Symmetry: D2
Subunit: 122 residues, 4 copies
Amino acid sequence: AFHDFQARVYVADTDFSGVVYHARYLEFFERGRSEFLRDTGLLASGVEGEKLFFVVRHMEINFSRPAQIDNLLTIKTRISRLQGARFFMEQYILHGESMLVTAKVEIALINEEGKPRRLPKE
Amino acid sequence: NAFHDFQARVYVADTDFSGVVYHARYLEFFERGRSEFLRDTGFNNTLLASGVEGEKLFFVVRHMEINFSRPAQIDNLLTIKTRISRLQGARFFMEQYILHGESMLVTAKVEIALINEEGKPRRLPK
Amino acid sequence: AFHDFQARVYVADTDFSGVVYHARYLEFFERGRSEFLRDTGFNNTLLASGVEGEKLFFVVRHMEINFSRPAQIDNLLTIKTRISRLQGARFFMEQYILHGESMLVTAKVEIALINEEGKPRRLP
Amino acid sequence: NAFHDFQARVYVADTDFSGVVYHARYLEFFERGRSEFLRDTGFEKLFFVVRHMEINFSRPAQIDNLLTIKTRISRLQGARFFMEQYILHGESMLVTAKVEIALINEEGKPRRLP
C-alpha cells in the first residue's frame, strides 16, 4: 500500500499567486520518501567505508490542483518497482480527498564523488 | 526557433549535504530560463498579474519531466537553454536544458497553462 | 511562556557542508511563529480573510539571530517561541531551536501587522 | 574598501503569498553578494559559517525587480570577519544586514583565514 505522511503548508511554501510554489512539492515528496524509509528501516555517516547518497535520477510530475497556506497535506508513497541498482516510487500529494499533484520518481545510490553503487537489504 | 541562453551561478543555497545542487533547485533555474524568455519578448509576470488584460493572470506548470544526468557543483556557472516547442492557444510546451560548459547536466519537458486568480484556465494572448 | 513545536530535518534543509543551511533556520522559526498563532485559534488564512475588517499580514521588521550549534540530517528539532513584548502596533518574539536539550539557534524577532497596501495597523 | 556591487533579479521562487519576497530569501541574496565579493578578491575541507546575523527589513522587493546587493568587510579579527550588507532596488533601500562570518572544518572546529 501507500505509506501516508502529513505536512503543513507554511508561508515559505507559497508564492505571489497565493498557492504553493511548484518546486516546493518536490520537498514534500522528499519528506514522503524519507518517512517511507523510516517506516521500514547511516549511509551518509561514514559507516561501511564511504558516504553514500540517494539521488533522484528521473522525475515525472503532474500538477492538477494547488495547495493553499495552512492546508494540512497528505503524502502517499510506495515502491512501484525495485531493481538492485535503483528503485522506483509512485507519489501523490492530497488535501483530504482532493488530488493535488502526482509523481513517478527514479532513485539510485551514489558515493561522495558521484559513482553508482548497488543497493543493500530492505 | 533558437534556444535562448541564460546563465546563473551556483551558491551555497543551491546545494545539499551530498555536495552538489539539490534536485529541486534545478527547477528554480529552469523557472529563471522561462521567465527570461517571457521578458525577452514582453509579457512579464508583473504585467500578467497586474490586471491589465482585464483580469489577473498567472502561468502554471501543468506537467514536467526532468532527467538528472550529471551534477552541478558549488560555484559552477550554468547555461540554461529554453525554447517553446509547441503552442496551443491555452497550453504551451517548453524544452529546457542545463549545461555546465559543454556538459549536459539536467534536461526537462515542461507544460505551461495560463490561469486567473480563481484558478480557471484562460486562452494565451497574441 | 514558550510554545513548543517540532520539525524534522530533511535533505532539502541542508547544504554542501553537512548541516542545515543558515536561511532554513528562518523557515523553522516561521513555522514556530505560525504554530504559535495557530494555538491562539487564529491563523495566516484567517488574517488574510478580513476579520479586523481588512486583509491582514504579518511582516518581519527586524531580526537578530545567533547560530551556535548545527542541526544534522534527520535531527528532530524543537522550536520554542514566545512573545517578549508588545507595543500595540509592533510585537517582539524570542525564539529558540533545539536538538533535544542542546541549544542550536536563537533569535529575537520584531513583527508588525499590515494591510494589503503595506500600511501598518494595531493588533486585535 | 568601497562597497562591492552585485545584481540579482527577483523570480517567482523568491516570493510568498503576500505578493512580496519571502523574508528568508533575502539571506540568499546577501550570500550572493558575499561570494561575489570573495570572487572579486580572487578567492579537511573548509567552509564559511554565519555566526551571527542582524537584519533590518525596511521596504519590500517585488517580482521582476533587479536588485542591487552592496557588500563590504566592516571589521577583520583573524578568526572571523564582519560584513555590512544592503539590498537596494535602484535608489530605494530595502534590507540591511550586519553579518559575522567564521571558517571551520568538517568536524566543527574553527580555523584561520588566508
